[model samples]
Target: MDETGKELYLVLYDYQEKSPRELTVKKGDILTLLNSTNKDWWKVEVNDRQGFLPAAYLKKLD
Candidate 1:
């Protein structure tokens, strides 16, 4: 977990933003987890950008 109490995850695949509310992320990108209340989509922060990403595209950093 980060100092802000949020979990960190690694992006497993490059994702393109299909919607205005989604975020674009490259493979191997590290992101801060914001919320996972939804099973398929999770809110995350990467490079100061916050948006929803596919949960399957991320791997928990243990």
Candidate 2:
């Protein structure tokens, strides 16, 4: 986590570059931030923070 007051930074990788994203991410067919707040609504991050994915997008890491 960075001292920028951000808790966890999502490992957003698309194509080949990395950038702070604001959309739901998926990796290895796993879902991250599951059962999280508003999960029913699929409020994953809010942009750089994912909100909801059509069929899951990110895999949460441990």
Candidate 3:
């Protein structure tokens, strides 16, 4: 993890998918930054499930 504590992020889209690796993000749900090796995607945990989210779909918090 780049940061030790949970980092907050904004979801820019629903990020819907049918795989266990994919999770649908609710507009009002909270998001956290976990890990990511590339710039294209990010690994995040939401609602107890960790999945890969598009980097473009998330906005950094300062």
Candidate 4:
């Protein structure tokens, strides 16, 4: 497998899915950052699921 550097983010708050394009995340959930072209929302992947999440709900991890 090709290993590339990917940012890991921690969910700061529980997010309920409001649309089909949104992902549900719980507090303390760790997810990988996929894209952040938008300031208010970011694309993340977790548990083999990919969707857009609010940027304020995520915190970057080292």
Candidate 5:
């Protein structure tokens, strides 16, 4: 990853289909999320791309 941060629930928009409005995500990449359900993070970014995913898909790295 490039940096450590938090991924919060962003506006639900579809890029190609059910994706972030202006998501700059690639095809294959591992990224971190904050999960709208919880808020215990400081910052978040992309492992390769940058965009917002479903809050329900948020998770921390091991």
Candidate 6:
């Protein structure tokens, strides 16, 4: 396992939109899996910050 108690998590692609709160991400960005209520949305932490994004945009590392 890695730091932040996450074994795997990486940005699947780049995303942008109008939102007061959002996670900064690009292709190949490693993100810490914080918490998720469902696959539709999830909490992700990166650069010591937390934000919400689509769960479909995350990829698991081997």
**Best model number under lDDT:** 1
Give the TM-score of each candidate.
0.87, 0.26, 0.74, 0.86, 0.32, 0.79
Residue pairs in clash, model 6: none
* TM-score-sorted candidate list, best first: 1, 4, 6, 3, 5, 2
Candidate 6 on 5-59: residue-level lDDT in tens?
Answer: 5656888799773485877688877887778888888888766778988888888
Q: How many collisions per candidate? A: 0, 12, 0, 0, 4, 0
The regions of model 5 sitting more than 4 angstroms off are 4-29, 33-44
Candidate 1 lDDT by residue in tens digits, 1-62: 33576667999999999998999999999999888887899999998789999999999887
Model 5 superposed RMSD (Cα)? 7.5
Q: Candidate 1 versus the native: TM-score?
A: 0.87
Q: Over the full model, what C-alpha lDDT does candidate 3 score relative to the true structure?
A: 0.75
Tens digits of per-residue lDDT for model 4 on 1-62?
12258677899999999999999999998899888887899888877889999899988887
Q: What CA root-mean-square deviation does each model show from the true structure? A: 2.1, 7.9, 3.7, 2.4, 7.5, 2.3
Instruction: Name the better of 3 and 6 by TM-score.
Output: 6
TM-score of 2: 0.26
Candidate 4, residue 17: Cα displacement in angstroms equals 0.5
Question: Residue 16 in candidate 3 has what lDDT?
Answer: 84
Please give the lDDT score for candidate 2. 0.37
Reference-based lDDT, residue 38, model 3: 96
Model 1 clash pairs?
none
Candidate lDDT (C-alpha), each: 0.90, 0.37, 0.75, 0.87, 0.40, 0.77
- Tens-digit per-residue lDDT, 1-62, candidate 5: 44546432332332232444324433343556523344532222454544445433333334
Local accuracy of candidate 3 as per-residue lDDT tens digits, 1-62? 23456777888777786677766786655678778899987888776678887878888766
Query: What TM value does model 3 have?
Result: 0.74
Off by over 4 Å in 3: 1-4
Better by lDDT, candidate 4 or 1: 1
